[PDB]
Symmetry: C2
Subunit: 236 residues, 2 copies
């Protein structure tokens, strides 16, 4: 008489987040990913939270493991067996880090992006596409790094073009503005474009800071705007 | 060829990387090696299993809090409770398997090979602790049978623990876990208060050993404050 609905699968993803069991959350979200239709603002947030809390603990672990490997290589008399012990272990994490990104980017290219119709939904998928391509480039080297980052820039530029339609004070637009600026500085080795894009987004946010703030504090908003207007007048 | 030193650093590296599922697998390999586990090795065995059972225990009490809220709502959703029940049993399946791994190894490998009096208390404490986690969700006569093995393991630990000094971390660590076992599992508060106070009063008596020479004057006041509170509580 009664079968399981979409709201039940959304609730299970919320229960996974409450229990902090994110491995099961990926499995639950994949069931909703297999279902046809466009995800809600709540559902896309749940997809972002689920995958970030799996790659997060493993990215944090990688920065510890690689520093121990850098410690043993920098030693006066290095043990090659202990170096190999860390090196195989690091590559096992690198195998897992690639697997999570391999899971999401396959789903993004085949399911989410071709089905998307909304303007702000398009930006959210292309930002997420750019983010998980960026994580792959964090440990990749040589020709592999350039090939991965090449498809990463294409995803970020596609995200930036649509986000121009969005208001300057939107969390997705600002979230993209942070992640694009990090991508130039940390991966692409371009500090000039990193400082340019982050400033232009920050200047747009101060201009529409009046929309963020209540009408009680709009006078303090205008002084903050005028203080920023002085700093733009200076250093010509 | 891989030796014990190689696997110890691997078990240390698993702790450094915070990957504890791999830590259990490496500690089982050292358990397969010749001889009894050393003090540094036993300490790693305790850290490895606690950080696997911990996230499962923490998730359990939050889910139970959600389940209690869902059952006592004005508009209860029975389909949601069924979704929670299957999910709770899946955690309970996992909670069983972690405890089934350690207690089978303790009964067959760790305890029978134990020669040290120092090591003996540590294994029986671990025997008592992981039987206690099983009784935390077990119901009816099934709870009675598991707690029966838990009481035998804790009492076996207490006898050998009396040989140890009162300020020992293993003796104090047992005394904390035995007192929790009375209050939370056995529902005996008056015996929980008895054993915890006995360990605390003995620790303050030997508190001069723990504290530095620079702060021995503070220790004597802490002893005198404890001596005053023990006499003022009566009448």
């Amino acid at each position: 008489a009664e079968a399981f609905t979409r709201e039940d699968y959304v609730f299970m993803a919320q229960l996974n987040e409450n229990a902090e069991r994110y491995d099961e959350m990926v499995e639950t979200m994949r069931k909703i990913s297999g279902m046809e239709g466009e995800l809600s603002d709540k559902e896309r947030n749940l997809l972002s939270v689920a995958y970030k809390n799996v790659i997060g603990p493993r990215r944090a672990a990688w920065r510890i493991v690689s520093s121990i490997e850098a410690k043993e290589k920098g030693r006066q008399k290095p043990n090659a067996k202990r170096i190999e012990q860390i090196r195989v272990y690091r590559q096992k994490i690198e195998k897992e880090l690639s697997d999570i990104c391999n899971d999401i980017l396959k789903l993004l290219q085949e399911q989410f992006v071709p089905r998307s119709t909304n303007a702000d939904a398009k930006v959210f998928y292309y930002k997420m596409q750019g983010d998980y391509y960026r994580y792959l480039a964090e440990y990749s080297s040589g020709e592999d790094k350039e090939k991965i980052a090449g498809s990463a820039l294409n995803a970020y530029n596609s995200a930036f073009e649509i986000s121009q339609q969005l208001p300057p004070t939107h969390p997705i637009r600002l979230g993209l503005a942070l992640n694009f600026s990090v991508f130039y500085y940390e991966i692409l080795a371009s500090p000039d474009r990193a400082c340019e894009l982050a400033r232009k987004a920050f200047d747009a946010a101060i201009t529409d800071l009046d929309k963020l703030t209540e009408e009680s504090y709009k006078d303090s908003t205008l002084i903050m705007q005028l203080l920023r207007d002085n700093l733009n007048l200076w250093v010509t």
